[PDB]
Every structure is written in structure tokens, then in C-alpha cells.
Design a protein around this ligand. Structure first.
Ligand SMILES: [Fe+3]
Ligand SMILES: [Fe+3]
Ligand SMILES: [Mg+2]
Ligand SMILES: [Mg+2]
Lengths: 423, 423
């Protein structure tokens, strides 16, 4: 079994490091004064970057891999996506959900993602997707720790037996309580749904992740209730507000007032760059707003924010390979976090900040933690992001669970020359 | 020498095709009724997609590869970029420009780009970068047909001897006349500069490519003069309006009136997604506009529009590997061209439409044309874009000039499994 990771670079640290492994955990981390020789039981990072696993804080595995079945969304709109999904209803079975969820999970394993939070639609009396996902969670456990959010897609108060189904999902084992206040029939139902959501989370000791204000409506301010209730219950760490795209459209004075509460509450925020840029701003003609939440300002204020892929190869987002560096690339551009340091520190948005959002207790390259880490063939976060590098090795419990042999590019000039896209 | 390309898929066509080569040209193209066996002198596309070479219609090779030298742009702003570039002035020499231009050109060759249009700053009495680029053009000719735009970055009428230097650049061999009307001191200088630009293009029989209305100013309408002058001279095919980001902010009524002229004029448009999303909208707080020209509407109106990378690894854009599928990916998202067909047809924005913009006369997979083509290991444009595939082979004059052995990813579950990110 592997005993050491050598010649490792670490974010924010100078030089090379050696990570000692014992009994599936990191026993010690020591600096090196030079390059160490390879040997049996040593995994050579080759001066590449070693980081804790990538995290997917927000994805919908119940709808993944269904784009084009039976027809393609040709307009690319949300409306048509709903219709295309409805045409596939006859194929939505227990086995179908498991098969598609596993397909995307395999892409995630290949992409060094060892933690995934999936939302599952529970506005279905049969809870078909949920039952399937609970089995998938057990099956994929050796490679990925999967959290399941009971997501009442059609609303809690605006759908028949919505609250009862949400609670049933928790009784069956869902890890997180979801909600969608802006989709409820009225603002009052929206606020009330949040009180019910928090009551359920406290009753069952579960986390909370609300699809919050995902709409270009400057009056959609459910985020203040999410933050206020979290602060009241002293449970900010266990709470997440996903999307909050409406915040992109708030006036600055209200946003400034709100930010004080957001910081005090300690809640987490998830932005989904690939889907937000695609689905937001659809009611604008020109100019067209970007529609991503205030990521830059959150970072400047010390508010925890991270990035999710949201959807992969489905009616609402036809693209994706479940790659977090790709999600990060889109977010840095749309949020204008393009300074060198902002880009370099970007890795935090798909690693540490996301681990905090999932309330993970065993995460990070530190003595005592499980030996879960990945190796990127790049010098730092900036380099990894610029070159969209693959994951050279993914290690879990001190064992390699994924590896990618890099592509080899050659140009034939007066003489053949290898191209690695580095200067 | 290669005699045939077999098992090739072609955009918009059904089945597989065989492309016969003779004397460096495509002699004939015949459909296949099944998979053909490989053999000596046959390049097997392996049911991958064969297309004419990728094109880079807008890049700045004179500033490429300079990010972080001597310092990094930490704010990521245009303003700081100017200051960071100024700090490197002592390193701006003939050899330095050639070295950096060649570095990016090699990345382009590796990425299947055989046609490149580079703008070169000619607001320099010594014309240092231009002299260097003219040598680079000759040196890279076996692999890339490089067009040089004499770009008067500081203005034609607003910079000392600006017009004289622009003409000197043409007398030295620049292929295209550039301009930047919105940067001139006054609207009047802007309009006058365009008359001077067109006069020079007609005097020397050169193409035109204007950095046009690259500013979030709803009153910046120099594009109407570019189109009107082209129509008057009957030279639309030889004219290009780069950027036109101001169009993102025009009212709809004026835009509708303008579009009639744009279509009638026949001029070309270049949008630069990666840089536009980064540099536009910087004077907005929230909401923030996207700032890309009206690509979707141009396509719907039959107006030729294409995508450029603009900058690579410099003070104005720190990222990039000179990859056109990456540029396309960003543009499809920001312009909301996310329907299946829109994404699949996306390849036109980095191939055929760009060739038209460069007024290329030998481009496309057709009998009689030079055997210049590339092979993507994907089923169609949608697949190539989704998976951000590399260029398996780049062929020029019937000879392989670049090749990429794909990365190999394996996940170790109960048994090892190869992952190709296809469903
Ligand atoms: Fe979601
Ligand atoms: Fe430019
Ligand atoms: Mg969604
Ligand atoms: Mg520029």
C-alpha cells in the first residue's frame, strides 16, 4: 500500500512537500528542501499540485444524462426543457435513475470529485427517484460520499401533500432538507415554507439547502429569511442558500444591509456558473444581465461561497462532463475574478469552500485526516485552471481510485516538437 | 504520402465519407456505405469528424505570453493591464516579439488552427512589433497563413503621425487596415478616421478590420459608418467590424434599422467571448451586462459573425491556450445559443464563418481545394464542444503537421474501467 506522496506542491505554500500515509490516514506532512527520489510505495506528485478532493456541492443526478431523450431541446429554453422531460416520463424508472446517476458519478470519480451533494425531486408521491438515489448512495460510498437533498421542486405549500412528502423523504434518509420559496404561489407561502423547512431540519437534525431566489426578480428576497432563521437557531454552518441569482439584480443599498446579516448568520452560498449564465437573463432583451449571485463581494466580505455544476447533459443544461475546473473557469469569467490572485485562489471555490458548504468533518491535507487527496499536473491553481488539466491521480483512503495519463500533443515543424501549453 | 482520409463524418451530412487526396489537394469526396478498412497511405478518421482547419480571426500576437512580466495584473482591470505592460517596455525587442508570437503560434498549430489574423500595434514610430511580425509571417507560412492587421491602437487622428504610420505599415506589407474610432478624441475624428481607413484599403487593395465600438456606450455607432462605406465601395466581403460590444447596449429600434444596412453591406463581424465577458460591463455595478455583440440575431439574419480568442496569456487576458473550442464554449453560453442545433452548428463560428471573415479563397472540404483539414475525435459539433476534444490530426497540403494522442482516464471500481465521458 502507498506510504508516501512526494514532491507535492500545496496551495499558498512555498516549495515541495512530503505527505506520509498510515492506516488510510495522513500521518504527517513535512517540507522537502529539494526533489525526493521515487521508490516503492511512493506516489510521485512530480512537483504537481496536491489538494483535498474536488467537491460537487450542487447537482441533479435524478435528471442527468437525459438530454435528447426522446427529443432534443432545440430552443434551449427552460420552458422547452420542461416539455422535453415530460416526453421521457415513460422511461423514468428505478433502474433508469440508478443507471444515469452512476454514469455521471463515474465521470465525477474520474474528475477527482469525492464529495457530491445531489438534489432529488420529492414532489412525487411515489418518490421513485429518491428510492433509487438512496441505493446509489450506498453503492458509490467506497468512492464518493453522496449527500441527498429532499428537493420539493413543485413547492412545499403549493403542491399536494408537499410538506408530508418532504418529511417522508427525510424519514427515508435524505441528508438535507430542501425548499424553493420563489416558486411557491405567493410570497407568504414562500416565507412560511422556510419556517417549515427549518422546523424539519431541527426535528431530524439534518442540513438545509434552499433553491433560493433563482429568478431575475429584484423583489425575491427569501435569502434574508434563510439567513435570519439560521441565525436565530444558531445553525448557520448547516445551512446553504443555492443560486440567489436575484441578488444580481438587487439595489446596492439593500444588498449592503443584507450582507451584515449574511456574515453574522454564517450560512453558505452556492453559485452555479454554467447554468446561471445560460438560464438567467432570459427575460431581458439587450442589454442582458449575467445573473450570477454576488460572488466577488461575498469573497471580499468573508462570506462562504462556492461553485456547483448544477446539471449535466439534461434538458435544462445539455452540456458538461462534470468537471469542476470547467465550472470554475466559467465562474471566474462571469464574476470578473480575473486578477492573477483571484484566479489562483479560485481552487478554493471548488474545494475548501464547498467542503464547508457540505459541513464536512474529514477534509483537507492535514495530519489525522483520511488520506483523500488528488494530484493535478500543474504548478498552482492558476496553471491548473488555465490549462484545464485532468486529475493525474485521485487517492481515497490511501489508495488510488482514478488516474489519467495525459494527452500527448506533437507538432511537426522542421523537427517534431512536444507541446504542453506552458511557456 | 497520404492518399486517403477514410471513415470521416462531415457536418450536416449523413454517414461516413472518403476523402481522396492527390498532389496536396482534395481530388474527390465519396460517400461510404459502411466502415472502410485501414491500409498504407490511409489516415483513418475512425468515424470522427473531419472539418476544414480552425481559424483565429482576431488575436494580438504582439502582446501574447507577457502576463506576469515583470509583475502580475492583480486587479484584472484594463487600467492595471496598461500599467503592467508599461513596466515591461525594456524587454520589448524584435527577438522578444518573434519568440512570444511563435510560442502562441505553436499552440495554435497544435490546436488545428491553420489561419490566423493578428492585429499589430502601429502607434509606434519604430514599428518594432510590425517588423518582427512580418518575419514571423514568412517563417510560419508552411503551417499557418498569417494575416497582419496594421492596428493604430492609439488612434489615427488622435496620435502623432498616426495616419502616416498606418500607411507606412501598409507599405511594409500589412494585409489589413485597422482603426479604432471609439478611442479617437471625438466622434468627428472617429468618423473621419474611417474615411481615411477605407481610402487606404482601396489605395493598396487591402482588407479592413476595425476595432469597432468596443465600449459599453449606447451612443458609439461607428459600425454604421463601417457598413455604409463598405456598401458604397461595394467591398463588404473585404471588411470586418471587430467587437461591436456597444451593440449589446443599443435600443432595439435603432438596432432593427441598423440590421438592414448590416445585411445589405455584406461586412463581417468578430465577437471575442473570452475577453468581452471579462472586460465589458466593468462600469456597471449590479446588474451587470454581458457585453457581447448581437451574435444570435446576426445568425438569425444571415449576417456573417464568428469568434476570436483576442488575447492569450497577457495583461488584458491572463488565460488561454489558444483553443477555439474553448472560445466557442464561452460564446455559446454568454450568447445563449444553447439549443442542441445551435450548439451543434457552433463549429461554423470557428471555421467557415471565420474563413469568410478572412476572405479566404482556398478553404473547405471540396474537390480542388488544398488538402487542409483536421480530424476531431467526436461524432459531431455538439459532441466535440461538450467534451472539449483535442485535434487528433491536423493535415496541411496532404501532410500531417500535428497530432494528439488522447488522454487515457481509468477509474478503479470493483474492476478498472475506462472513462471517455460519452454516455
Ligand atoms: Fe438545482
Ligand atoms: Fe483586438
Ligand atoms: Mg435547476
Ligand atoms: Mg483588445
Amino acid at each position: 500500500a502507498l506510504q508516501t506522496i512526494i514532491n507535492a506542491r500545496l496551495p499558498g505554500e512555498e516549495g515541495l512537500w512530503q505527505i506520509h500515509l498510515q492506516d488510510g490516514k495522513i500521518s504527517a506532512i513535512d517540507a522537502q528542501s529539494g526533489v525526493m527520489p521515487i521508490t516503492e510505495n511512493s506516489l510521485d506528485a512530480e512537483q504537481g499540485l496536491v489538494i483535498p478532493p474536488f467537491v460537487e456541492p450542487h447537482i441533479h443526478l435524478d435528471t442527468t444524462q437525459t438530454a435528447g431523450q426522446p427529443n432534443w431541446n432545440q430552443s434551449g429554453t427552460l420552458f422547452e426543457g420542461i416539455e422535453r422531460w415530460a416526453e421521457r416520463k415513460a422511461l423514468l424508472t428505478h433502474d433508469d435513475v440508478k443507471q444515469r446517476a452512476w454514469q455521471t458519478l463515474k465521470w465525477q470519480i474520474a474528475n477527482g470529485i469525492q464529495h457530491v451533494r445531489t438534489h432529488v425531486d420529492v414532489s412525487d408521491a411515489t418518490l421513485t427517484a429518491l428510492k433509487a438515489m438512496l441505493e446509489v448512495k450506498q453503492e458509490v460510498a467506497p468512492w464518493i460520499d453522496l449527500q441527498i437533498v429532499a428537493f420539493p421542486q413543485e413547492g412545499i405549500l403549493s403542491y399536494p401533500n408537499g410538506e408530508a412528502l418532504l418529511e417522508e423523504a427525510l424519514r427515508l434518509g435524505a441528508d438535507v432538507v430542501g425548499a424553493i420559496p420563489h416558486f411557491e404561489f405567493t410570497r407568504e407561502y414562500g416565507v412560511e415554507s422556510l419556517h417549515k423547512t427549518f422546523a424539519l431540519a431541527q426535528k431530524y437534525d439534518r442540513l438545509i439547502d434552499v433553491h433560493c431566489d433563482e429568478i431575475d426578480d429584484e423583489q425575491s428576497r427569501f435569502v434574508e429569511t434563510v439567513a435570519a432563521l439560521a441565525h436565530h437557531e444558531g445553525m448557520g454552518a448547516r445551512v446553504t442558500a443555492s443560486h440567489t441569482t436575484a441578488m444580481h439584480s438587487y439595489n446596492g443599498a439593500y444588498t449592503s444591509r443584507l450582507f451584515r446579516l449574511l456574515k453574522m448568520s454564517g450560512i453558505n452560498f452556492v453559485a452555479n456558473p454554467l447554468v446561471n449564465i445560460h438560464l438567467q437573463g432570459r427575460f431581458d432583451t439587450y442589454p442582458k444581465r449575467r445573473g450570477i449571485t454576488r460572488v466577488k463581494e461575498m469573497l471580499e466580505s468573508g462570506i462562504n461561497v462556492c461553485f456547483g455544476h448544477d446539471a449535466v447533459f439534461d434538458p435544462w443544461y445539455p452540456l458538461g462532463t462534470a468537471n469542476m475546473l470547467q465550472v470554475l473557469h466559467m465562474g471566474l469569467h462571469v464574476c470578473q475574478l480575473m486578477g492573477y490572485g483571484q484566479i489562483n485562489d479560485g481552487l478554493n471555490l471548488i474545494t475548501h469552500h464547498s467542503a464547508r458548504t457540505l459541513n464536512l468533518q474529514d477534509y483537507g491535507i492535514a495530519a489525522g485526516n483520511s488520506a483523500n487527496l488528488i494530484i493535478l499536473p500543474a504548478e498552482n491553481g492558476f496553471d491548473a485552471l488555465r490549462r484545464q488539466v485532468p486529475v493525474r491521480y485521485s487517492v481515497r483512503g490511501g489508495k488510488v481510485i482514478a488516474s489519467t495519463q495525459p494527452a500527448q500533443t506533437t507538432v511537426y515543424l522542421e523537427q517534431p516538437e512536444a507541446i504542453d501549453y506552458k511557456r
